[PDB]
Design a protein around this ligand. Structure first.
Ligand code: HEM
Ligand SMILES: [S]
Length: 184
């Protein structure tokens, strides 16, 4: 189960964050890691379509090859804090698993600037028991975390050395599909 009420960035700029571009996960901190963690690569596009906040997600496990996409509409809880019902889709946006109650994640932007962000997510999926996940994002694939986001990690009272890097994972990303999915 999740345990954190993440605080959103003061002065969070939603239009800048939800601009249609892609964010790559470069480092992450799972507060409830599985006994045997599946080391996934992940990226998302965040945008606005017809005035609705949307995110498209991409997960890729570079060992098993497991790959999946999702699209979500985000509902506002407060500035920088959202609740997202996800639907699993193929890369083209065709629905594989429909939206359903209890399949959602919360999403809090704790820090963001033009190139980087720190987010918290809490995933709820059926009868699974999942915990908090923090992620450092960058606009550039596998970019080393800069001082601004690392300082935000500290300011959240988290230790960056505890984060797991995805940068050495042989990750590949379908960023064109993520961008196009925002309308789906
Ligand atoms: C490197 C960072 C991440 C890792 C290692 C990771 C890992 C995983 C894993 C292992 C699952 C499968 C859960 C299961 O069904 O047992 C999953 C599902 C999911 N994750 Fe992540 N994740 C990451 C980042 C993110 C982010 C940043 C978000 C939200 C923005 C997110 C949202 C989701 C959603 C919505 C699902 C369920 C999708 C579906 O079933 O259709 N993940 N993730
Ligand atoms: S996740």
């Amino acid at each position: 189960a999740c345990t954190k009420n993440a605080i959103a960035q003061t002065g969070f700029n939603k239009d800048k964050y939800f601009n249609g571009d892609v964010w790559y996960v470069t480092d992450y901190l799972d507060l409830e890691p599985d006994d045997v963690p599946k080391r996934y690569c992940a990226a998302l596009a965040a945008g606005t379509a017809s005035g609705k906040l949307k995110e498209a997600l991409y997960h890729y496990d570079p060992k098993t090859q497991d790959t999946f996409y999702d699209v979500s509409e985000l509902q506002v809880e407060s500035l920088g804090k959202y609740t997202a019902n996800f639907k699993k889709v193929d890369k083209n946006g065709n629905v594989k698993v429909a939206v359903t109650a209890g399949n959602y994640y919360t999403f809090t932007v704790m820090y963001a600037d033009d190139s980087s962000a720190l987010i918290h997510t809490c995933l709820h999926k059926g009868n699974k028991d999942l915990g908090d996940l923090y992620a450092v994002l960058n606009r550039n694939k596998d970019a080393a975390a800069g001082d601004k986001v690392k300082s935000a990690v500290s300011a959240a009272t988290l230790e960056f050395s505890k984060f797991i890097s995805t940068k050495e994972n042989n990750c590949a990303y379908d960023n064109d599909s993520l961008k196009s999915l925002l309308t789906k």
